[PDB]
Design a protein around this motif. Structure first.
Motif, PDB file in Angstrom:
ATOM      1  N   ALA A 185       0.838  -1.185   0.000  1.00 32.21           N
ATOM      2  CA  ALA A 185       0.000   0.000   0.000  1.00 32.21           C
ATOM      3  C   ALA A 185       0.877   1.240   0.000  1.00 32.21           C
ATOM      4  CB  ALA A 185      -0.946   0.024   1.203  1.00 32.21           C
ATOM      5  N   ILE A 186       0.296   2.341  -0.458  1.00 34.05           N
ATOM      6  CA  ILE A 186       0.955   3.638  -0.493  1.00 34.05           C
ATOM      7  C   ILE A 186       0.188   4.558   0.437  1.00 34.05           C
ATOM      8  CG2 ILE A 186       1.864   5.463  -1.957  1.00 34.05           C
ATOM      9  CD1 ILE A 186       1.620   3.709  -4.320  1.00 34.05           C
ATOM     10  N   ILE A 187       0.831   4.992   1.511  1.00 32.18           N
ATOM     11  CA  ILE A 187       0.202   5.906   2.453  1.00 32.18           C
ATOM     12  C   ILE A 187       0.477   7.320   1.964  1.00 32.18           C
ATOM     13  CG2 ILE A 187       0.138   6.756   4.791  1.00 32.18           C
ATOM     14  CD1 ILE A 187       0.831   4.038   5.776  1.00 32.18           C
ATOM     15  N   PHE A 188      -0.570   8.014   1.544  1.00 30.89           N
ATOM     16  CA  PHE A 188      -0.467   9.401   1.127  1.00 30.89           C
ATOM     17  C   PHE A 188      -0.989  10.279   2.251  1.00 30.89           C
ATOM     18  CE2 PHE A 188       0.565  11.963  -2.510  1.00 30.89           C
ATOM     19  CZ  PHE A 188      -0.049  13.163  -2.249  1.00 30.89           C
ATOM     20  N   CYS A 189      -0.167  11.219   2.689  1.00 28.44           N
ATOM     21  CA  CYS A 189      -0.523  12.128   3.765  1.00 28.44           C
ATOM     22  C   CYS A 189      -0.852  13.495   3.185  1.00 28.44           C
ATOM     23  CB  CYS A 189       0.618  12.235   4.777  1.00 28.44           C
ATOM     24  SG  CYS A 189       1.010  10.686   5.621  1.00 28.44           S
ATOM     25  N   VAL A 190      -2.040  13.995   3.502  1.00 34.28           N
ATOM     26  CA  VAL A 190      -2.510  15.293   3.041  1.00 34.28           C
ATOM     27  C   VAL A 190      -2.715  16.180   4.256  1.00 34.28           C
ATOM     28  CG1 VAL A 190      -4.116  16.483   1.530  1.00 34.28           C
ATOM     29  CG2 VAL A 190      -3.736  14.030   1.266  1.00 34.28           C
ATOM     30  N   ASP A 191      -2.173  17.386   4.202  1.00 30.47           N
ATOM     31  CA  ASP A 191      -2.345  18.370   5.264  1.00 30.47           C
ATOM     32  C   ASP A 191      -3.402  19.360   4.797  1.00 30.47           C
ATOM     33  N   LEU A 192      -4.568  19.327   5.442  1.00 33.49           N
ATOM     34  CA  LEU A 192      -5.647  20.232   5.071  1.00 33.49           C
ATOM     35  C   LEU A 192      -5.378  21.668   5.496  1.00 33.49           C
ATOM     36  CD1 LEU A 192      -8.774  18.025   5.793  1.00 33.49           C
ATOM     37  CD2 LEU A 192      -8.090  18.992   3.593  1.00 33.49           C
ATOM     38  N   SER A 193      -4.380  21.895   6.350  1.00 33.36           N
ATOM     39  CA  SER A 193      -4.125  23.240   6.852  1.00 33.36           C
ATOM     40  C   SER A 193      -3.514  24.130   5.776  1.00 33.36           C
ATOM     41  CB  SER A 193      -3.216  23.175   8.079  1.00 33.36           C
ATOM     42  OG  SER A 193      -1.857  23.046   7.700  1.00 33.36           O
ATOM     43  N   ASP A 194      -2.542  23.610   5.033  1.00 35.12           N
ATOM     44  CA  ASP A 194      -1.806  24.417   4.063  1.00 35.12           C
ATOM     45  C   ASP A 194      -2.625  24.545   2.785  1.00 35.12           C
ATOM     46  OD1 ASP A 194       0.310  24.618   5.885  1.00 35.12           O
ATOM     47  OD2 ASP A 194       1.250  22.788   5.119  1.00 35.12           O
TER      48      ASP A 194
ATOM     49  N   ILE B 274      -0.497   0.852 -10.737  1.00 31.70           N
ATOM     50  CA  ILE B 274      -1.856   0.636 -11.223  1.00 31.70           C
ATOM     51  C   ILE B 274      -2.661  -0.202 -10.235  1.00 31.70           C
ATOM     52  CG2 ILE B 274      -1.241   0.959 -13.647  1.00 31.70           C
ATOM     53  CD1 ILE B 274      -1.231  -2.108 -13.925  1.00 31.70           C
ATOM     54  N   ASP B 275      -2.002  -1.109  -9.516  1.00 34.24           N
ATOM     55  CA  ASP B 275      -2.685  -2.047  -8.640  1.00 34.24           C
ATOM     56  C   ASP B 275      -2.501  -1.730  -7.160  1.00 34.24           C
ATOM     57  OD1 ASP B 275      -4.124  -4.814  -8.530  1.00 34.24           O
ATOM     58  OD2 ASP B 275      -2.402  -5.090  -7.197  1.00 34.24           O
ATOM     59  N   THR B 276      -1.510  -0.918  -6.806  1.00 35.41           N
ATOM     60  CA  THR B 276      -1.209  -0.649  -5.407  1.00 35.41           C
ATOM     61  C   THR B 276      -2.253   0.292  -4.826  1.00 35.41           C
ATOM     62  OG1 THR B 276       0.252   1.181  -5.994  1.00 35.41           O
ATOM     63  CG2 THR B 276       1.224  -1.008  -5.824  1.00 35.41           C
ATOM     64  N   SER B 277      -2.914  -0.147  -3.759  1.00 40.45           N
ATOM     65  CA  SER B 277      -3.949   0.655  -3.135  1.00 40.45           C
ATOM     66  C   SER B 277      -3.333   1.795  -2.335  1.00 40.45           C
ATOM     67  CB  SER B 277      -4.823  -0.211  -2.232  1.00 40.45           C
ATOM     68  OG  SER B 277      -5.472  -1.225  -2.976  1.00 40.45           O
ATOM     69  N   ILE B 278      -4.152   2.803  -2.059  1.00 45.28           N
ATOM     70  CA  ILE B 278      -3.710   4.017  -1.389  1.00 45.28           C
ATOM     71  C   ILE B 278      -4.546   4.210  -0.135  1.00 45.28           C
ATOM     72  CG2 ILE B 278      -3.412   6.503  -1.576  1.00 45.28           C
ATOM     73  CD1 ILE B 278      -3.266   6.059  -4.649  1.00 45.28           C
ATOM     74  N   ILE B 279      -3.877   4.406   1.000  1.00 48.03           N
ATOM     75  CA  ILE B 279      -4.552   4.739   2.247  1.00 48.03           C
ATOM     76  C   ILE B 279      -4.389   6.226   2.504  1.00 48.03           C
ATOM     77  CG2 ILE B 279      -4.791   4.210   4.685  1.00 48.03           C
ATOM     78  CD1 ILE B 279      -3.108   1.616   3.939  1.00 48.03           C
ATOM     79  N   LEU B 280      -5.411   7.010   2.179  1.00 46.52           N
ATOM     80  CA  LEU B 280      -5.356   8.439   2.438  1.00 46.52           C
ATOM     81  C   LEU B 280      -5.431   8.714   3.933  1.00 46.52           C
ATOM     82  CD1 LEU B 280      -7.548  10.181  -0.288  1.00 46.52           C
ATOM     83  CD2 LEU B 280      -5.197  10.732   0.291  1.00 46.52           C
ATOM     84  N   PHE B 281      -4.742   9.767   4.357  1.00 50.81           N
ATOM     85  CA  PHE B 281      -4.732  10.187   5.758  1.00 50.81           C
ATOM     86  C   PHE B 281      -4.848  11.706   5.752  1.00 50.81           C
ATOM     87  CE2 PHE B 281      -3.046   6.091   7.411  1.00 50.81           C
ATOM     88  CZ  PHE B 281      -3.920   5.964   8.460  1.00 50.81           C
ATOM     89  N   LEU B 282      -6.081  12.197   5.825  1.00 46.70           N
ATOM     90  CA  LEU B 282      -6.342  13.632   5.808  1.00 46.70           C
ATOM     91  C   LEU B 282      -5.956  14.189   7.174  1.00 46.70           C
ATOM     92  CD1 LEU B 282      -7.614  15.270   3.348  1.00 46.70           C
ATOM     93  CD2 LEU B 282      -7.876  12.804   3.166  1.00 46.70           C
TER      94      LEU B 282
END
Lengths: 215, 338, 55, 230
Positions: free
Chosen positions: A92-101, A122-130
């Motif tokens: 999995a690919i952990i993508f970190c998003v900062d809602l502040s900036d 193409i197949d690797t899932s993403i775990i978003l972390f807002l």
């Protein structure tokens, strides 16, 4: 026709490959994840109970039945096409998003659009972390989110803004063999290892179903 | 004030292009198109080396044509006795992400490097029984792509932070820094005199440098995409070039220009590794479409197809005697043909 | 910027003030070398009848 | 790197002793260690062997059924357990390390022996009292019951120098390969069942007894020994 030195060399080779098989058996039970995001997007504090082991940064911790490994890939200012294939077998690919900036939000959107359509991902899932939702909700009164993201209507509330950001992130997804897992989390949220554990075991089950001809 | 300098540079490069054009009389056509064809080349699977549990990213042959070094993503550097399909050493690597490996000509040292930005050297002949780290070389700001040994003390490494450096193993310092190559330097090849080497980069340039100096002398140009491989001719006056645009070429040091180009219409995958025969007549090129086809360095002809790889080939090697060719892909198994 | 411009100006002089050949023998040397060394290279004409370097 | 062997001493003619040796300086598990005995006024003889990880254990003809060899890899100790000690076992027992891969140098280190008192291939080499002059060309010969050449292109024959009052040191392995630390004056060459160590420009620290070894068939055969005088 074998000599004594040849026989003992074959024995040494057998020991080497037996230890190789033992190491491969031991290392197969480790989940590998690829942390990503923008600058100071909460990558350094994704898990508060992690032990750290430059080019790239590797941090590991163990939770329940599995051992976790995270690759921060910070400081790799080179071209992001020559070493991505090294991280092709991540679960999995952990993508970190900062809602502040608000200024760097479009940078995160561009990076997400890049990684979600790459040939190796193409197949690797993403775990978003807002991440950083507390001060984002604190500052959502002054800023109505349309200064950085136009073409929407809403009551300028926290729930609708989070839903719109999540929808914009999932609109950059063009793949029938991938599911993006979203989970809003705080900077004071100790419950982050269980979120990743549930998402990762769901990913592994989904991949097993994909490989068998099912979903 | 920079406009005048830019105009002077443009005039100089126009003069250089005109000089290359005017020197290109009786060109690559009908100068080598007068001899017999190479023929049909078929190589059978003699060896299938197995033992990695990840993707093999590099491979280098020994100067005895007996020993190989294969470094993979599993954190292991296995040294192979090819004549008996045998393992000699297994060196556990500190950082598993590896993109290069080298073998010293004396047979005493092997090198390794990757995304840790460290060229870690190893000593095989020790009076303790096991391979140990001899020196860890650090100082680059980017990943290392290819390292090649000059002798037991001097290593030259191509890295992705727009630089190449020649080190000394004893003190671990950068003696010569080779500044240029605005892209990421992706391959490196040593001429058979340990004096001059080539280096391609992602900004579509194949510079030629000198070891005893610290500056370029010929900057070949002409590719429209990224580069991945490079390899000198046995004479020491020419070199090949493999690239991402499915286009493998031959360049010429004396002419300062580009000789015949062996590209195909239907091929679109990038080239990952190129190599030359003992005589330089046969060129073996790696392909990202699960294949590695051979060519001729003089004429354009697909003399044969070496197939059998489940994943992308990323390392190709021809021994010093030219007796066998090694082909390694990401399917964890690397093959030796004949 | 000025230092980079000076570096480019100096470097582009290095390829400017040298030239070697107009392909008079720059392609004849390849075809001369490959003909003489073809017997040395076993990748073109192998002889696995008495040598057998690999099985 | 140093091998120290402890134990030994007087024993009743019919009792038993358990000699033990330890290593400190090299990886023990990567080496196949040997036992080689030396009678007080005779040559060398192979006794016991254990491989890497105890995967292969071989004994000699006078050793089978009576002695046994074990190693303790976590504690880095080699054990020789002997039973029914006759009077023919009164010998100095050497511990020898050996590694096996392409380009290896087996029998490259010997430990100081243990004096024990209990109150195939045939190789015979040269003379035994040759008059060595300091500075000359000395051709110590050797012989074997077979041509010691294998299909791998490696002829196997080893040359050992025993300085007076010291353990043997390896000089030449395979047939013509210099061991590490041996000066360039030492050189050897030969063919099947005909081997010669040509020492040119003889100097000091070279007087002693010179030995052969075969390593094709595994039961080891030495020579009697050629002694350099003066």
């Amino acid at each position: 026709t074998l000599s004594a030195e040849d026989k003992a060399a074959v024995e040494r080779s057998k020991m080497i490959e037996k230890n190789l098989k033992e190491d491969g058996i031991s290392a197969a039970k480790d989940v590998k994840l690829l942390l990503l995001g923008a600058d100071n997007s909460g990558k350094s504090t994704i898990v508060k109970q992690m032990k750290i082991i430059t080019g790239i940064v590797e941090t590991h911790f163990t939770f329940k039945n599995l051992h976790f490994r995270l690759f921060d890939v910070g400081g790799q200012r080179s071209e992001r096409k020559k070493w991505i294939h090294c991280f092709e077998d991540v679960t999995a690919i952990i993508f970190c998003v900062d809602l502040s900036d608000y200024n760097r939000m479009h940078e995160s959107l561009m990076l997400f659009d890049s990684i979600c359509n790459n040939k190796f991902f193409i197949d690797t899932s993403i775990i978003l972390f807002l991440n950083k939702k507390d001060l984002f909700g604190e500052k959502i009164k002054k800023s109505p989110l349309t200064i950085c993201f136009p073409e929407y209507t809403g009551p300028n509330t926290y729930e609708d803004a989070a839903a719109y950001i999540q929808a914009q992130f999932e609109s950059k997804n063009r793949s029938p063999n991938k599911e993006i897992y979203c989970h809003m989390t705080c900077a004071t949220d100790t419950n982050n290892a269980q979120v990743i554990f549930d998402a990762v075991t769901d990913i592994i089950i989904a991949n097993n179903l994909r490989g068998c001809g099912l979903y | 004030e920079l406009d005048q300098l830019r105009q002077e540079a443009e005039q100089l490069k126009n003069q250089i292009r005109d000089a290359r054009k005017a020197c290109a009389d009786a060109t690559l056509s009908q100068i080598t198109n007068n001899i017999d064809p190479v023929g049909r080349i078929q190589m059978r699977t003699r060896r299938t080396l197995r033992g990695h549990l990840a993707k093999i990213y590099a491979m280098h042959w020994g100067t005895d044509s007996r020993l190989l070094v294969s470094a993979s993503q599993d954190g292991k550097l296995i040294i192979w006795d090819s004549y008996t399909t045998n393992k000699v050493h297994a060196i556990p690597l500190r950082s598993s992400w590896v993109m290069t490996c080298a073998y010293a000509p004396s047979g005493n040292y092997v090198a390794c490097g990757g995304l840790d930005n460290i060229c870690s050297i190893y000593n095989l002949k020790t009076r303790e029984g096991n391979v140990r780290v001899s020196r860890e070389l650090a100082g680059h700001t980017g990943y290392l792509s290819c390292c090649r040994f000059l002798d037991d003390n001097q290593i030259v490494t191509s890295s992705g932070d727009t630089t190449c450096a020649l080190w000394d193993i004893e003190t671990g310092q950068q003696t010569t820094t080779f500044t240029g190559h605005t892209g990421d330097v992706m391959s490196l090849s040593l001429a058979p005199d340990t004096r001059l080497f080539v280096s391609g980069a992602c900004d579509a340039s194949a510079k030629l440098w000198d070891v005893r100096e610290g500056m370029c002398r010929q900057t070949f140009t002409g590719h429209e995409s990224d580069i991945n491989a490079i390899c000198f001719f046995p004479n020491g006056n020419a070199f090949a070039t493999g690239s991402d645009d499915a286009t493998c070429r031959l360049f010429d040091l004396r002419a300062d220009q580009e000789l015949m180009t062996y590209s195909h219409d239907n091929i679109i995958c990038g080239i990952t590794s190129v190599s030359f025969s003992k005589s330089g007549r046969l060129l073996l090129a790696g392909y990202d479409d699960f294949n590695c086809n051979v060519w001729d360095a003089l004429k354009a002809d697909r003399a044969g197809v070496l197939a059998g790889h489940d994943n992308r080939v990323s390392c190709l090697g021809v021994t010093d005697d030219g007796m066998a060719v090694a082909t390694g892909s990401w399917d964890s198994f690397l093959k030796i043909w004949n | 910027s000025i230092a980079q411009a000076r570096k480019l100006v100096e470097q582009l002089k290095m390829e400017a003030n040298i030239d070697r050949i107009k392909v008079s023998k720059a392609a004849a040397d390849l075809m001369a070398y490959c003909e003489a060394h073809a017997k040395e290279d076993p990748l073109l004409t192998p002889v696995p009848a008495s040598e057998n370097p690999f099985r | 790197v140093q091998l120290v062997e402890s134990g030994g001493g007087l024993v009743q003619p019919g009792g038993s002793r358990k000699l033990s040796c330890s290593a400190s300086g090299f990886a023990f598990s990567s080496f196949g260690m040997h036992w080689v005995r030396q009678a007080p006024e005779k040559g060398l003889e192979w006794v016991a062997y254990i491989s890497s990880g105890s995967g292969t254990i071989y004994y000699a003809d006078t050793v089978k059924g009576r002695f046994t060899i074990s190693r303790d890899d976590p504690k880095n100790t080699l054990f020789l357990q002997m039973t029914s000690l006759t009077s023919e076992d009164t010998a100095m027992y050497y511990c020898v390390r050996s590694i096996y891969y392409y380009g290896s140098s087996p029998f490259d280190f010997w430990g100081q022996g243990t004096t024990l008192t209990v109150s195939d291939i045939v190789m015979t080499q040269a003379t035994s009292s040759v008059p060595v002059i300091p500075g000359e060309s000395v051709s110590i010969s050797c012989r074997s019951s077979k041509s010691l050449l294998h299909s791998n292109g490696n002829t196997y024959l080893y040359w050992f120098l025993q300085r007076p009052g010291q353990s043997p040191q390896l000089l030449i392995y395979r047939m013509s390969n210099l061991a590490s630390g041996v000066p360039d004056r030492f050189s050897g060459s030969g063919s099947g069942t005909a081997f010669t160590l040509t020492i040119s420009r003889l100097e000091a620290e070279d007087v002693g007894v010179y030995y052969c070894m075969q390593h094709l068939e595994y039961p080891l055969t030495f020579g009697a020994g050629t002694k350099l005088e003066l």
